Amino acid sequence: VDISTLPRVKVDLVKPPFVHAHDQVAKTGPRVVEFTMTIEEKKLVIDREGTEIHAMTFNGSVPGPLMVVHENDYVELRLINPDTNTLLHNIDFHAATGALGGGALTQVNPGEETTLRFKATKPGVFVYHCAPEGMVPWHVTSGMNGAIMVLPRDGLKDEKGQPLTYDKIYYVGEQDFYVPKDEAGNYKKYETPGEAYEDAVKAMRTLTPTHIVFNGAVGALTGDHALTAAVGERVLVVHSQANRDTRPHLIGGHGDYVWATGKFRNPPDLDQETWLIPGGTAGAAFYTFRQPGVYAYVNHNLIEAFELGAAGHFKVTGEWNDDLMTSVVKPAS
Amino acid sequence: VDISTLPRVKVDLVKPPFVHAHDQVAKTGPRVVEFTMTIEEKKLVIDREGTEIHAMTFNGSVPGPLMVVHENDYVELRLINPDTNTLLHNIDFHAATGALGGGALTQVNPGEETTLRFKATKPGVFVYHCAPEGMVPWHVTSGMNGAIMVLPRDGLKDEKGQPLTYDKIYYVGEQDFYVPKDEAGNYKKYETPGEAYEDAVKAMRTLTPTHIVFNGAVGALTGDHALTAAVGERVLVVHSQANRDTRPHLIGGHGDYVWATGKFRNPPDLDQETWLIPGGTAGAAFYTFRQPGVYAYVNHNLIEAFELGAAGHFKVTGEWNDDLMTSVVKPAS
Amino acid sequence: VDISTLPRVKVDLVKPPFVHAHDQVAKTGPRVVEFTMTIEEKKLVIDREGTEIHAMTFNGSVPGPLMVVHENDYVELRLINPDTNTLLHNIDFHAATGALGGGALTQVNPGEETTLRFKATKPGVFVYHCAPEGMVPWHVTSGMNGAIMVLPRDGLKDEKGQPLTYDKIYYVGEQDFYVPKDEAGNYKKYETPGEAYEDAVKAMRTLTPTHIVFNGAVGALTGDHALTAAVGERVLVVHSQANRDTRPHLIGGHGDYVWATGKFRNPPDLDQETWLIPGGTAGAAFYTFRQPGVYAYVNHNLIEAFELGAAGHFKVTGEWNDDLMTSVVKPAS
Ligand SMILES: [Cu+2]
Ligand SMILES: [Cu+2]
Ligand SMILES: [Cu+2]
Ligand SMILES: [Cu+2]
Ligand SMILES: [Cu+2]
Ligand SMILES: [Cu+2]
Secondary structure (H helix, E strand, O other): OHHHOOOOEEEOOOOOOOOOOOOOOOOOOEEEEEEEEEEEEEEOOOOHHHHHHHHEEOOOOOOEEEEEEEOOOEEEEEEEEEEOOOOOOOOOOOOOOHHHHHOOOOOOOOEEEHHHHHHHHOOOOEOOOOOOOOOOOHHHOOEEEEEEEOOEEEOEOOOOEEEEEOEEEEEEEEEEEEEOOOOOOOOOOOOOHHHHHHHHHHHHHHHOOOEEEEOOOOOOHHHHHHHEEOOOEEEEEEHHHHHHHHEEEEEEEEEEEEEEEOOOOOOOOOEEEEOOEOEEEEEEEEEEOOOEEEHHHEEEEHHHHHOOOEEEEEEEEEOOOOOOEEEEEEOOO | HHHHOOOOOOOOOOOOOOOOOOEOOOOOOOOOEEEEEEEEEEEEEEEOOOOOOEEEEEEOOOOOOOEEEEEEOOOEEEEEEEEOOOOEEEEEEEEOHHHHHHHHOOOOOEEEEEEEEEEEOOOOOEEEEOOOOOOOOHHHOOOOOOOEEOOOEEEEEEOOOOOOOOOOEEEEEEEEEEOOOOOOOOOOOOHHHHHHHHHHHHHHOOOOOOOEEEEEOOOOHHHHHHHHEEOOOOOEEEEEEOOOOOHHHHHHEEEEEEEOOOOOOOOEEEEEOOOOOOEEEEEEEEEEEEEEEEEEEEEEOHHHHOOOOEEEEEEEEOOOOOOOEEEEEEOOO | OOOHOOOOOEEEOOOOOOOOOOOEOOOOOEEEEEEEEEEEEEEEEOOOOOOOEEEEEEEOOOOOOEEEEOOOOEEEEEEEEEEOOOEOOOEEEEEOOOOOHHHHOEEOOOEEEEEEEEEEEOOOEEEOOOOOOOOOOHHHOOEEEEEEEOOOOOEOOOOOOEEEOOOEEEEEEEEEEEEEOOOOOOOOOOHHHHHHOOOOOOOHHHOOOOEEEEEEOOOOHHHHOOEEOOOOEEEEEEEEEEEOOOOOOEEOOOOOEEEEEOOOOOOOOEEEEEEHHHHHEEEEEEEEEEOEEEEEEEEOOHHHOOOOOOEEEEEEEEOOOOOOOEEEEEEEE
């Protein structure tokens, strides 16, 4: 059918780890879903030490926002590069088919905009990221990535084919940064992106991130910004890593149903302690909370988690179940 | 039902790579299974060069012992930290639900003990490890980890749902160590754990292990300590890595049935040459031996295996099958 | 049945990324399939800078050629080490059962040859590589690896069990090289392999490849050597990595059906954006092209791809489908 005859819906995106409102089960026929993103190059403090990088972002955040559509919707993205930016940007959707995921069609200089449309033919969670020719890993590792979820029109199903409905959804973007270091091991400082470039490339070539963070900074998903849930709630956590492998783990819980490589026509893996999301992939894990308290959600390379930053918290409210776990004899001499 | 009305069984653990006696198919109803572990901080020689580290262990071994129970048993662990130790320890079971896997409830100073109980609600092999707040990766990477296997009550099944019975079981714990190095590349030496700590953290932050070993040392599963089997025997190998990805491979064999991420409600992967066990996970592979001789079981990053230590041997006895493999023309000029 | 009563077929191998002619569906009963490979130690230029290594190859190429047989054929390999070589070589097939995959039976000094036969009992794609005792990772990381595909006798099937037929097949071997570097970071140069050895080992122990390439060199699968297809063609790409994990991704496409760990008795993963092939494994991905243009096929650690070399191109001819993707508003001020 002619695309002009389809309904259109405009979505306004929200900042991760939150996700724009949507329906799991498609309440309309196929639609054109309209999104707008504004590129912002900005300074960001990424750690407790106050290390500050020139970040490249979709819509002001690292990661970029989670977009949500249904299988066989059309995604129409208006991408704006304001004149206050210095660099050329584009966008590649792993969800899309052709033209380097859209990257060949979306090259915008500062002061320019473009509109891309693609059909979301495959259900799953997918990475999107910037990919300007000659400079891809630098943009991606400066924060310019996010994800898109293409739900099956009848929502998610378990390994047997019965409905799985989530009560809450969170989006964790994990970012590897590669801040250049001198012979002494201190982080170098740079006046312009072009003066940063070769040292950025050299730092990348070590394949050793200096920082690995959730939602753009060490401790971004802790304290007042901890994720929350209640006992008995079904939570979907979507987790992306555009460049580097990760292995999410909910300390004190499990992934009840996991799409480790994120594609919903496959049956989920059950009862996972830890699952591997390859670099360049988004995955999704569904868990029903059974106990209250603080949970840590970590990359289970524990060095990456507790020294380099890849750790956040859930604060869970509800009833303690002494059947599931109890202290029989509290620590004592 | 009230837990006090359940049978109780005490298990005495054995040193890896061996596994305490158990039944694959549950011969009783749900039980409380009682385990005791004693923490021992000790010096360990980890390589042929005589490099010696201050190891932190459950029950005197790296890895800690494999515990085996059935789905919906209760695990009751008595954890003892004797006054001869210097550090605070606890335990996190990935098999358990709540309170950071038990870690929030099991903090023991030297001279103290504690008893934790949890219900083993999910069948699979699972990592356990020490996780004291502020210091997790150091304890884990100093050897303080093991695994627990929660068997389905009717034992293991193949991809079709028919019984798979193992004749022998072995437990391979793979340990990444990060021994601090100076500018020249020699291994530094330290008087106390507190004086070691920052250099330990710096060494960890390289993300480059200095040693990757099976059962606590280079060559621990070779020679007189080679694993053994006979042609026609069905062997289960449980393999854990608490911190870092590994990729087991049996040189000369296969994984006939593999749970790469270790969870028994999923059908096994068949005919694997090599399988990926993510950091923070335990996996299980079942193989029926068809040829005699020496087999090497390795992490198939071959640098990790043959230079850094992640290699052991099987010595297999029985009949050579010339149908499966033969030398047609022996090496000659 | 006696092996001498089986038909014999001689195959002459072709240079990757191309694959010798074969039938997907077995047109004969079980056969002995005869292959010959000649070891060649040669100088190779591996990057745009003109960095030159002493490569060790099967049949003059990195990777070695893809061999193709059917389940329960016998593979008979004649391996020739000419007197112009300096080193001892052998071969280990992950497809074979016993004697370290053949490695214990195939040790050939320069001026010697050997013939090994094994039964291909398990369907899948499998790595083969050199594995001389005491020196395995050096040989493997100097290029001495390839793959073998053992097709099911009735060819490939989808997740439901219906036929999947490919129109073209390509073989991508991904090679991690570890060229030794001085304190300044320049690549060292060596007079003989024995003088190279310790520095090779030291470079390997960093676990940081200096180069990660497809088909033996940066840009080997670009330009005039780009892979090709037409819209609507079903392409199988076989991808191996003998030593190190990789995560293939077709920029602008997908893996419609993927065997990430390469073993055909398992159902394929559907609609993958990126898939993890563990070190020591071969995988296979099937894609039907739906759009024309240039596609990049990359390791989706984008540093590994765009800085260290792990990137090639597909040039695809055919009709552009504006339904699947279109530029609505071309980049403009
Ligand atoms: Cu950009
Ligand atoms: Cu990408
Ligand atoms: Cu401890
Ligand atoms: Cu853990
Ligand atoms: Cu060789
Ligand atoms: Cu191998």
